From a paper:
MTHFR catalyzes the physiologically irreversible reduction of 5,10-methylene-tetrahydrofolate (CH2-THF) to 5-methyl-tetrahydrofolate (CH3-THF), a reaction requiring FAD as a cofactor and NADPH as an electron donor. Since the product CH3-THF is exclusively used by methionine synthase, and only the demethylated form (THF) may be recycled back to the folate cycle, MTHFR commits THF-bound one-carbon units to the methionine cycle. Eukaryotic MTHFR orthologs additionally possess a C-terminal regulatory domain that is connected to the catalytic domain by a linker sequence. The MTHFR catalytic domain adopts a TIM-barrel structure evolutionarily conserved across all kingdoms.
In addition to HsMTHFR38–644, we further determined the catalytic domain structure of the yeast homologue [name] (ScMET121–301) to 1.56 Å resolution. This enables a structural comparison across mammalian (HsMTHFR), low eukaryotic (ScMET12) and bacterial (E. coli, H. influenzae, T. thermophilus) orthologues. In HsMTHFR (which contains, in its biological sequence but not present in the crystallized construct, the serine-rich phosphorylation region N-terminal to the catalytic domain), ScMET12 and T. thermophilus MTHFR, this helix α1 is projected towards the interface between catalytic and regulator domains. In our structures, the FAD ligand adopts a conformation poised to expose the si face of the isoalloxazine ring for the incoming NAPDH and CH2-THF. However, instead of trapping the electron donor or substrate (despite multiple attempts at co-crystallization), the binding site in ScMET121–301 and subunit A of HsMTHFR38–644 is blocked by a crystal packing interaction from a nearby symmetry mate, making π–π stacking interactions with the FAD ligand.
Residue numbers in the entry: -5 to 119, 125 to 159, 166 to 301
The structure:
């Protein structure tokens, strides 16, 4: 009781007896779009998310919009907010300003990311090179005042695939002080489960690990998400969408809800409840996620 931190994603995760979700949002490009998203976020608090996240454009391209939205959400929603933060190709002063502003706004969680590969200005010659460089820097500068998350790849990272290679780098990130891990999206439950077994044996028996999940909002959008993330779609899932279903968008969406429910239930059962938190890539949409949560 004495040591519990009510704003820490790690402490909140372990304290839960029952399973739960988290939600990732992005900053809209207009003020009207931002007002509308805040209304949507307010409605989605009825799904009882453990925390919400706000994405960050590589190289600082959305710095002001991300910082503003994360702070506004933290102040008004009464839910912990985790701000994403990429480190390559950005001046140290921008990273320092972002962390200072988060700290002063009451934000106590950061998802520490590389972003794109490092690159300079050739002969005109950027001190962060990998995500681990940012994890170490945050912990040096703030200790446990920030609970720090990092990214993982059950099917391996691909530059714009070897999951064992990335497990080596993931271990370095955890040893440097990462407090939780969120995965790239996947549709093959067995790729996630083999990864989770390797994570427990080689990295940590207890660290919070969230599968990242992308709803199926149309047949074409589903295929596009898998293409961009380099995630495989198993034959057993593809067979649920024969041509007569593919042509019927309402049927695709309904079957898509069932596939996500089944994925979640299989993970919870097969891991004996070790995996009790499920992270959704919302793309600022509510309906599919509300059905997945209400029908489960
Ligand atoms: C949950 C989640 C949220 C995300 N949010 C965003 C976002 O808001 N904005 C955005 O731009 N991107 C985001 N990304 C994408 C991410 O920035 C890219 O996948 C990026 O290419 C790698 O980031 P990382 O932090 O996993 O990098 P790292 O863990 O640094 O690894 C990336 C690669 O760097 C190399 N590497 C790492 N460490 C070492 C080492 N010690 N020695 C040698 N080589 C090494 C490896 O080749 C490795 O595959 C997100 C990803 C996830 C899973």
């Amino acid at each position: 009781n004495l040591y519990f931190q009510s704003m820490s994603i790690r402490d909140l995760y372990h304290a839960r007896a029952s399973p739960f979700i988290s939600l990732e949002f992005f900053p809209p490009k207009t003020e009207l779009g931002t007002r509308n998203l805040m209304e949507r976020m307010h409605r989605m608090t009825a799904l009882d998310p453990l925390f919400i996240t706000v994405t960050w454009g590589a190289g600082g391209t959305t710095a002001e919009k991300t910082l503003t939205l994360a702070s506004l959400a933290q102040q008004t929603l009464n839910i912990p907010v985790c701000m994403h933060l990429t480190c390559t190709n950005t001046e140290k002063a921008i990273i320092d300003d972002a962390l200072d502003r988060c700290y002063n706004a009451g934000i106590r969680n950061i998802l520490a990311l590389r972003g794109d590969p490092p690159i300079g200005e050739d002969w005109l010659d950027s001190p962060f090179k990998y995500a681990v460089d940012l994890v170490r820097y945050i912990k040096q500068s703030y200790g446990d005042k920030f609970c720090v998350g990092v990214a993982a790849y059950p099917e391996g990272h691909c530059e714009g695939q070897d999951p064992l290679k990335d497990l080596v780098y993931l271990k370095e990130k955890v040893e440097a002080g990462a407090d939780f891990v969120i995965t790239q999206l996947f549709y093959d439950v067995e790729k996630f489960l083999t990864f989770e077994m390797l994570f427990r044996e080689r990295i940590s028996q207890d660290l919070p690990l969230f599968p990242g999940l992308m709803p199926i909002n149309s047949y074409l959008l589903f295929h596009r998400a898998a293409k961009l993330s380099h995630a495989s779609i198993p034959p057993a899932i593809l067979s649920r969408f024969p041509p007569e279903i593919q042509s019927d968008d309402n049927a695709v969406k309904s079957i898509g809800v069932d596939i996500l429910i089944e994925l979640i239930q299989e993970i919870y059962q097969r891991t004996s409840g070790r995996i009790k938190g499920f992270h959704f890539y919302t793309l600022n949409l509510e309906k599919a996620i509300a059905q997945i949560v209400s029908q489960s």
